[PDB]
Design a protein around this ligand. Structure first.
Ligand SMILES: *[C@@H]1O[C@H](CO[C@@H]2O[C@@H](C)[C@@H](O)[C@@H](O)[C@@H]2O)[C@@H](O[C@@H]2O[C@H](CO)[C@@H](O[C@@H]3O[C@H](CO[C@H]4O[C@H](CO)[C@@H](O)[C@H](O)[C@@H]4O[C@@H]4O[C@H](CO)[C@@H](O[C@@H]5O[C@H](CO)[C@H](O)[C@H](O)[C@H]5O)[C@H](O)[C@H]4NC(C)=O)[C@@H](O)[C@H](O[C@H]4O[C@H](CO)[C@@H](O)[C@H](O)[C@@H]4O[C@@H]4O[C@H](CO)[C@@H](O)[C@H](O)[C@H]4NC(C)=O)[C@@H]3O)[C@H](O)[C@H]2NC(C)=O)[C@H](O)[C@H]1NC(C)=O
Ligand SMILES: *[C@@H]1O[C@H](CO[C@@H]2O[C@@H](C)[C@@H](O)[C@@H](O)[C@@H]2O)[C@@H](O[C@@H]2O[C@H](CO)[C@@H](O[C@@H]3O[C@H](CO[C@H]4O[C@H](CO)[C@@H](O)[C@H](O)[C@@H]4O[C@@H]4O[C@H](CO)[C@@H](O[C@@H]5O[C@H](CO)[C@H](O)[C@H](O)[C@H]5O)[C@H](O)[C@H]4NC(C)=O)[C@@H](O)[C@H](O[C@H]4O[C@H](CO)[C@@H](O)[C@H](O)[C@@H]4O[C@@H]4O[C@H](CO)[C@@H](O)[C@H](O)[C@H]4NC(C)=O)[C@@H]3O)[C@H](O)[C@H]2NC(C)=O)[C@H](O)[C@H]1NC(C)=O
Ligand code: NA
Ligand code: NA
Ligand code: NA
Lengths: 215, 262, 215
């Protein structure tokens, strides 16, 4: 029972935004670390719901700062294949392994739920300061894979932060996105838009606007 | 008479608590039935056999050991350290000269198993082993000096403390000076020189130099330090290079290009 | 057949932020020892406050784990100002299976404390069509991230809320959002809800902001 050691494998999902926009390229990434100089050859086998595919691209060996090798294989996935819950398996073979290592990843299971998006103006207590906070409340979505952005007048906003998805009591997720703008931009009536991308939305997106207009 | 010499078996200068190590007092002129004087930090040890065995190491065994037998001079000190911990980076020597091999070992407490071992030099891991293995650097140079430690994966990943190793340089790069200035009249004698000299006090050591021009050899390994062209016609002209090394050649160093014109 | 190298591990936890900010509560540092073997279960603790040894600790009884190991816990009551002033607390664990005693240390997160800004946000007009309704508390600009946020109404705690983890903002400070879910009938009836925040950088370590239907 003395065959411990050898490389390790980590399998990563595609970015949520790449699976939702048909123009982008969603990819699953199989990363092999702790590859020795004595046994540097790594072999990748890719499977989609059990059947093998051969279109993945393997990057050449790259020596890390700890004198080990790191080998990465990238598999382009079809947008609807990932969204429909297909399983992606990476099988890694190397002479230093007693048996190939298999890692499987797929989208979180469960019925998708449409997010509700609400924009909230700054609190009147914050108007005394030089920069105000614009809030985008996104709640009730499942799975937690989502992308949130801000823009105004056809240009992205350069100063916003979004909290991680938080599990709500009903099994769905929620988050908040805080856009920080100069108070003058807000009081001058500029229109700011919160764009939310999620598979449960029509055309995989919705956007809600926010502007100073009590008068 | 020459000095006595202490040898360690195993050669590791650092051991764990309750581990064993035997010290060997070697004298060149082989004696018969003569007492051996052992010293720990200058204090006489009550053991007179030619070897000294530590059966269960403790902190009381740490320090400098010296030995002497017969008409020999007292040995140079060997420093033994006793440690407690998960991993211990064991070295065969704390101070070395260029060209002398260095042995490293990532030793696990109670001879337990670790895998995916990393050997570190000055904070950077330079060697990785899937299964725990010793590491030997045969042709050492000054770049191999520094603080060494190791890490290995057992139930958790464990890391040893550091230990410093110095590899002292023997002679600098033998730059090739130019005595006669270039250009120069066809017909004037030239005096070539290879500029390097020792750094340590090595009594019985002599460097042997070799003068090159381009790639063709001119004078091989010779005890002399100067290439003597009788009187210069400048087909013996161009990029001249020198090389200085030990007689065993285990440390070799080059020269900068001396573009000579006569 | 040699064994893998390893023994017990020590994990050492800080007090709850609310316990260090309220003089009526008792903050505690906790020293947890895992992987204590059956063959050698004896564990000894030694505590040190800024170097000096203390003896006011209490050691809970052992507890078997599913993986056939023990988990002994030692709890040390700490002084409020001692923790807030940055004093370090040291737990020293000794056991046969260890080659040497393990030492762990914690202290308050170092860095200049920054006062939190607390803003309450009423529900979006688009959410006023649902049966339940979201009340938002924005807390931003605080350092360190140690903070406590709660909701209350009419002297009673409102517990139907969720709070995001602290998020590192682009200016080095932290922010978070707390979402209280209320029935729309309660909101439109004029009930006053309050967001209570405790942080070391606040005056009296406490502030609260109220929220209700304005007209
Ligand atoms: C020698 O060095 C190498 C190299 O490391 C580098 O060099 C050394 C010298 C150091 O300087 C080091 O700091 C450097 O990073 C070492 O290799 C490392 O090995 C460790 C393991 O020992 C790996 O740790 C795992 O990391 C996972 C996450 O990694 C990501 O995030 C970190 C930073 O947080 C990055 O550094 C990584 O590179 C990863 O980054 C991600 O990379 C993806 C692939 O490219 C990106 O996805 C792609 O992105 C592109 C765009 O570029 C496209 O969009 C593609 O579409 C997309 O796919 C991704 O964006 C990117 N993200 C980020 C944020 O950057 C952890 O997840 C993992 O934890 C799991 O496993 C642990 C077991 O080891 C376990 O303890 C954890 O609990 C966790 O387990 C999971 O738990 C969940 C539940 O929560 C379960 O559901 C899961 O089933 C379970 N999984 C498993 C497998 O059990 C590890 O912590 C480390 O990643 C790796 N580094 C690199 C660079 O590969 C090596 O270890 C060294 N050797 C020695 C002996 O020291
Ligand atoms: C055998 O079993 C045991 C038992 O495990 C449990 O039992 C069974 C049922 C299993 O199924 C298992 O799943 C169960 O968990 C195993 O023991 C476990 O061992 C692992 C390590 O192998 C431990 O993992 C570390 O956890 C740390 C934090 O844990 C907390 O959070 C988790 C949940 O997220 C809880 O499960 C823990 O219990 C901890 O929860 C805390 O508990 C405290 C109780 O004392 C609370 O404090 C006190 O609470 C009371 C109230 O009760 C009062 O309020 C007191 O005032 C208060 O003090 C505390 O509030 C509570 N918190 C929470 C959130 O609940 C991790 O921090 C740690 O990660 C560090 O170390 C890793 C490697 O060691 C490293 O990779 C990480 O990066 C990280 O390193 C830190 O990184 C940060 C940056 O993020 C740095 O700032 C730090 O400096 C850096 N530090 C270090 C040291 O590196 C580990 O993940 C696990 O906790 C432990 N479980 C238990 C229950 O103790 C055992 O491992 C098993 N054996 C094997 C071989 O598998
Ligand atoms: Na190997
Ligand atoms: Na390294
Ligand atoms: Na070994």
């Amino acid at each position: 029972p003395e065959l411990l050691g050898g490389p390790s494998v980590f399998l990563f999902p595609p970015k949520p935004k790449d699976t939702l926009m048909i123009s982008r390229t969603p990819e699953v990434t199989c990363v092999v670390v702790d590859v020795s100089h004595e046994d540097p050859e790594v072999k990748f086998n890719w499977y989609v719901d059990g059947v093998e595919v051969h279109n993945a691209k393997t990057k050449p060996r790259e020596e890390q700062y700890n004198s080990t090798y790191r080998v990465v294989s990238v598999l382009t996935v079809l947008h609807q294949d990932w969204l429909n819950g297909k399983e992606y398996k990476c099988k890694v073979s190397n002479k230093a392994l007693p048996a190939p290592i298999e890692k499987t990843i797929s989208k979180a299971k469960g019925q998708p739920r449409e997010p509700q998006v609400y924009t909230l103006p700054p609190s009147r207590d914050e108007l005394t300061k030089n920069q105000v906070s614009l809030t985008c409340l996104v709640k009730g979505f499942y799975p937690s894979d989502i992308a949130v952005e801000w823009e105004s007048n056809g240009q992205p906003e350069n100063n916003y932060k979004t909290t991680p998805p938080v599990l709500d009591s009903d099994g769905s997720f929620f988050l908040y996105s805080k856009l920080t703008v100069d108070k003058s931009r807000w009081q001058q009536g500029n229109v700011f838009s919160c764009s939310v991308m999620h598979e449960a939305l029509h055309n995989h997106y919705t956007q809600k606007s926010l502007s100073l207009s009590p008068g | 008479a020459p000095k006595a010499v202490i040898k360690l078996q195993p050669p590791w200068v650092s051991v764990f608590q309750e581990e064993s190590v035997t010290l060997h007092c070697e004298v060149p002129h082989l004696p018969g039935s003569s007492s051996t004087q052992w010293f720990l930090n200058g204090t006489a040890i009550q053991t007179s056999t030619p070897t000294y065995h530590i059966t269960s190491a403790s902190e009381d065994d740490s320090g400098e050991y010296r030995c002497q037998r017969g008409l020999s001079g007292r040995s140079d000190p060997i420093q033994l350290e006793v440690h407690r911990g998960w991993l211990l980076l064991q070295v065969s020597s704390r101070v070395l000269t260029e060209g002398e091999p260095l042995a490293l070992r990532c030793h696990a407490w109670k001879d337990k198993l670790v895998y995916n071992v990393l050997y570190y030099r000055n904070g950077k891991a330079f060697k990785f082993f899937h299964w725990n293995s010793n590491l030997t650097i045969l042709k050492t140079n000054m770049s191999h000096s520094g603080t060494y430690h190791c890490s290995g994966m057992g139930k958790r990943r464990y890391t040893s403390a550091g230990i410093s190793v110095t590899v002292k340089e023997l002679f600098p790069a033998p730059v090739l000076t130019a005595s006669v200035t270039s250009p120069l009249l066809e017909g004037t004698p030239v005096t070539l020189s290879c500029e390097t000299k020792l750094l340590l006090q090595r009594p019985g050591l002599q460097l042997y130099f070799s003068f090159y021009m381009g790639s063709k050899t001119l004078r091989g390994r010779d005890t002399s330090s100067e290439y003597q062209i009788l009187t210069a016609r400048r087909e013996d002209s161009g990029l001249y290079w020198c090389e200085a090394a030990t007689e065993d050649g285990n440390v070799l160093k080059r020269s900068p290009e001396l573009e000579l014109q006569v």
